[model samples]
Target chain A: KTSRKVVIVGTGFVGTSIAYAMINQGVANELVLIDVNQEKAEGEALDLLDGMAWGEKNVSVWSGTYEECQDANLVILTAGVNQKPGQTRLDLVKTNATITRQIVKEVMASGFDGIFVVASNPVDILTYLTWQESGLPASRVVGTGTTLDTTRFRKEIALKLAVDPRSVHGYILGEHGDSEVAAWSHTTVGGKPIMEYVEKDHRLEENDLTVLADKVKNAAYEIIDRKKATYYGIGMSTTRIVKAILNNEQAVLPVSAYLNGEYGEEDIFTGVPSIVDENGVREIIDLSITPQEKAMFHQSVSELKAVLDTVRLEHHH
Target chain B: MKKTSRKVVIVGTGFVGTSIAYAMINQGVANELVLIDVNQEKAEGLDGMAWGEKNVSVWSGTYEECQDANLVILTAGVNQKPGQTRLDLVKTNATITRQIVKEVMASGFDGIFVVASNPVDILTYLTWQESGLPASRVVGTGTTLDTTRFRKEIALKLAVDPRSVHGYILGEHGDSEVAAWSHTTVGGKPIMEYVEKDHRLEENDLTVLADKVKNAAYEIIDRKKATYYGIGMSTTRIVKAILNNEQAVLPVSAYLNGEYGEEDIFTGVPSIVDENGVREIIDLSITPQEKAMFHQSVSELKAVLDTVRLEH
Candidate 1:
């Protein structure tokens, strides 16, 4: 019926943040919030329903079970442990991996034939695990990888240039965690190269692009130390991905996707700019990177692969 | 200099104002939002900033910031005491609105005014008079929330989406409002006709629906203590219509001189809105019963108006 419905598998801080964003954005027709804490899920639903007065569209939010996800168009997985203060997203792997395996097993058993949007920490590893467990085509499984990092990347650069961040365009490639790389070699402002623009438009005496990359990697730590765990940025990034998937916006987003020899990587999930739509990762754009940037991509891939090697996927057809 | 990026300056940074900012940011209704609290609290809310490729810039600002704004949304108002009606604060709100509008006008705000302050119709009328701007430049979030409440009421009884319930509430935004049942329809089908045909819906059920629609705000206040989310959304819709120049026909408080023989009042009626503000008030054809109800509603508003002191 062209009706779009989303099932959020986790209703924690991060999950609720995405839910709040979806309601605020009027991004979907039906939103089902699934959480282990049934009361919190129901309470979260009513609380969100209370805010239904804020949006134009009739986006209904309710808590449901994994079994109710068969009809959902997108299943967002945010059910995992979060990063602690001063801890990196990589540190969240071992515990979240076990949680991810169980959730995917139950969700897939629901016969949920929909796109899998993974946002659990150590996303590249969880995304790969989801792909293995769900047996869905890699195209149908997406991750909120460097998309949030890309946002930080663009925001930092925009802050530096004193211009609208929308005027800047680039990618935060590879892992969604500490190992991610800013595709500065391919970055542009108003379609002008970042290097050339900094030479001409930079207001600061010395513009170090490395700081932009560094700030993006460490953004979660700064926020986590202050606010316990960071979700608004991640929530927003996930909501954007959901909107692109449901609305078939063909929006270009740097999300964690399975790399099939793109950067000489095999089994790991890493971020790359892709055309996201209803059918999920419609096409991954092969970004041209400088020699050093390519080395950064390989490094990110090797690091993610190290984490993936630890996950034990159950065998299936 | 042909910048099409939308900017909204919210005069009050209270609950209603912040909710408006949150909704606008969510919808990408504006590229920038400038909040102006007389006390000047910093913008610290995590109304998520990064929405995919879109981003919004927010900062606490002063009245002078309104000069460069394309629109200034007035959501600031003094609250009434316990166990008091909205009109109880009318005298107090008038002075508050006048001062706010004057400061905005003095800031060289030539753009449209989207006012949602309480006693909205009265304040909207006051803003039009104070700004000395054409009546067309001022818009109020009048019965839009009431109309949404109306839709929800009917949708519940009919087992359909509230969005599918295409009815409107006209006249005052308060307890003295009228539900235009004559113009009410469900998916282009007359509501009365559907009720008659459904066999499960009794005519009395329809009456109950109207009552629920009429008292929705009171019901919410009884539970949540205050209603801003719905009003905030209503404000966002009106502002979006103005900014995007959507030309949407919605129920809003607009200055009325001759429509329905009403004079010197700003009350809720369906209006065609655009970038310039209230483009034209859509004069709906209603049944005799609805017409009588509307006349009574407007009469009640006039009585409230006669007590107020409107300035030149």
Candidate 2:
């Protein structure tokens, strides 16, 4: 007897793609798109609605105010600024940080007590900031994390093995950026250790694994280099997370979740395998990785902390 | 007892057809998608969506691939220019439809045909006549998209979810279509009764909503150049109903042999759809006004079909 309402904040390429994917798959019963530009949001909603007659289920879509977020089950934030020429990375992060804070405050003002799934860039940092500003549980605020990267990793591996990507299981740990680590130690294809294939099959070796990892790590850069933007993959990945939470699938996905000493890391959000359900992240899956992978994960966390230091010092000042 | 592959072959890689391909890939509606087009480049970019992880195999292939496809969706047709009517493109599209059907049937494609080409009701009848398949084996998108708009328009007026509103846009999939107000119900109550209880609506509102539903395609095209996203979603929905064998009741252009006082023509109506195709057309009792509207719709399609010379 409950309504499966989802409110999307910041209707842009990424956000609208998510809505269309949801429509195509019939994910939510009610979807609201909110953007700073009302006309842009309204146009996107109309475009999406044009296709609703073909959706998997009856989904009501419209552009609305943040007030609509009050009773939603999940509020997805994909609204943020992109970096431009002559601007430092920190400059973009700071500007987006302020926007995220304001948006979070407005959402909370609407009495929106549901989970916040952040897809804004510097996603890990903005995700952590969302948790702090909203005063919600860290578990309730998560990010896209390495979810997209993990899909890329699975896809690349599937191509290498000539199998379906869904058959490959692995996680892309650490950040959702250049420094993310692939947990090759825990990687498997159909219950068999990946290392076994490397050792026994002459076609595959340890360095081959390194090549695939590099491919996954640089997938976004290559796509952006060619197409100037990548949304469809992230769009599908984001919808997967939304469905996981809304349907209460209790599925294990690699997302940017708060690390509370699960991998000997604390007080930062990073990509890891976590159990996600309706109440948000249920628990982290503590997988034993190689020593090298552990060091890489630690380095990734330190890089995030360096950025967090600036924001924290500003707050104190 | 056997592994069945639900493969769909889409003809014509235009915006409307390609959008349906995109929706199908996003939803993984079929096990495989074989896109056919005269121009290879038109179907070139869709494989890029394989990166989305839906596990549905997509490729551009020849009619040879249709040999084993479970369904063939025909969207290849001459475009409807600003001044030209849907009926104007029919002769050209009908000739094209005959060629595609000849190729597909030559390859032993023994599956359902879901037609979304322009003047869909007429083309569906043409596809049926040319393919020599049973009448139940072919269906058209018809007013399915229009019906969605009908429900959505009502839902929006009431600020409710469109799924909660049950209704149909009957007749043709064109300007002459009728909104079946007689059968439209809101949560088990007649819409007329429900609106009477609520002061926000007047009887004229229903007429306005129906008009809005009728012109929704034009309104959307006026904004977005061409309307494909909605039709893409709509066409794929019919494909899903057939593949899943849901026996779902949907609004589509189905053949009639004496139902609703119409014979030997295909037009939009509420029908039961299954894997075998249009299982049955629901004969709803309607008022004289609606019946007249339905007849006018049939008349429009019949006039167009008379012009179309299906070379059997």
Candidate 3:
């Protein structure tokens, strides 16, 4: 009986998977998938409708225009240019930035006041720019920072320790790409320190540990190399974040948020643990990182700032 | 993937709601449930625990002991005793039966099989008889102990416990009962076969066992002014046959087929059952007296069978 509606502005593989996961889990009552390619969106909506009978609840899936955002509780922005093969997420910045700005204008015109969950490349910068351009409260705009990468990190560690992925708690700090740092100090398996567990186990060597962490960091590239597109897992991760917000569960997730003075950083978007609810990023959790980790985090932030400089040039022109 | 492993059983609450509940939960790949009753000794076993989650392969809930059934799997039976008002279960049985059956069937019916409703004396007899279900489908504990008198006759010669004897008291299961002594045996040794094992055994105790069996029903009826304990235990007995499938063959009110040289009769007969329900009916060679008693029991059964009769 509760109304749970989500407006997703994209019908790509990631967007469609999010819709699929939502229906499978009975997370929402209505989902509107929009795209510049209206035909593709319509096809995806029809396929989703066919799968409704097997789901836990009745969900209304449809293809709609930006005007449909008027009543949406949350609008997920998965539109914009994706990183093509042999291209980094940063390389897609110019075209994606244009697409993002146009979509935000349409959404604001439709009187959309709900939170915006952005997943475009160079996501932290784009999310920050969207927040500033829309003039919404900073809390209402969030980016899918390193949340998926962080999940991959924990799941990888879980595989090593033979524990449930949910029991492993850790995060990939900073950008959602190659520059991201796996915060090793906070890593735990079944709430036990991973370092302590490994020392006690004595079966694993140092090289084995580093290799697994690196694999977790590079998992996207490995999948992209084979499939030419990475969707399912990341789509599921994004769906989980949206569900937490819709359910008002106050779930802690790694998301891009404007930093005022946390960790000696200011006026920049970066990955940090924040409580996500109906209003999006409610509050951030500050964790102490090692000197090397902090430096790596700052380096990733600098790279994102460089990308923002290019976006600023195009915006001003 | 998650493992789907859980089994449950409902004893008695009629066949409609209880059967649908079984089917619905089974489709969810729930483990299983055994439906049982008092007047009849047949056990109904519905197994639906085949679906498995990818990561969790084994079912979380599997077969459990019959004694620990969690939910109300069986309905209460009604008894028609002399000089007692039958008003207690009339509306309570009908209303509660519909309500409990609907909700339990909705909550995925994770546990317990209940025997609900009453007028159990004849209701149990009629349910198993007319329900068009298999023998193991339900059980009605008719006047089986009355036949224990026949076992005592042979027990006197062999000095064995009458409880250890295997057989049934077939017929009306009420006051007018017949002990099937011709097939009564103590550990595979027939009453007649065991008579040759010892001497100085009087044949009079056999009549005493029959008289005592008949009086036992009335004795409890007289002292308590209303009897429910034996029947409550009877419900538990059916629960055990379904939960453990002990394979204990006993005389109970059930739908009879061509096995007892009778058809379309819902009378007390001997049946074998496991957790899955009445696996088979033990066909014993009956003496002429027992045969006559069974025929009279069948005639008594025909009287109440008219209550449910409709023009359609």
Taking the candidates in order, what DockQ does each have? Answer: 0.12, 0.23, 0.01
Candidate 3 residue-wise lDDT, B128-212, digit = tens: 3333334445454554344444455545544443433455577665566776666554432345543444433346656766666
Give lDDT tens digits, candidate 1, residues B1-312: 877677789888766676676667656788888888843321122323333235678888789998889899988776666887756678766777788889999989899999888778878888988899998899989899888778776775666777667878988865678888778888888877766776666778767767766755454432222324566678988999988889998899988877766767888999999989998888878887877888888888777766664645
TM-score of model number 1: 0.76
Give me candidate 1's interface root-mean-square deviation: 7.3
True contacts kept of each: 0.13, 0.31, 0.00
Evaluate residue A98 in candidate 3 and report its C-alpha lDDT on the 0 to 100 scale.
78
Question: What TM-score does each of the candidates earn?
Answer: 0.76, 0.83, 0.51
Off by over 4 Å in 3: A1-3, A37-46, A84-91, A199-201, A221-231, A313-317, B1-312
Error of 1 at A211 (Å): 4.2
Model 3: share of native contacts present?
0.00
Q: Best-fitting candidate, measured by TM-score? A: 2
Docking class of 2: incorrect
Total residue pair clashes for candidate 1: 0
Error of 1 at B275 (Å): 6.2
lDDT preference between candidates 2 and 3, better one: 2
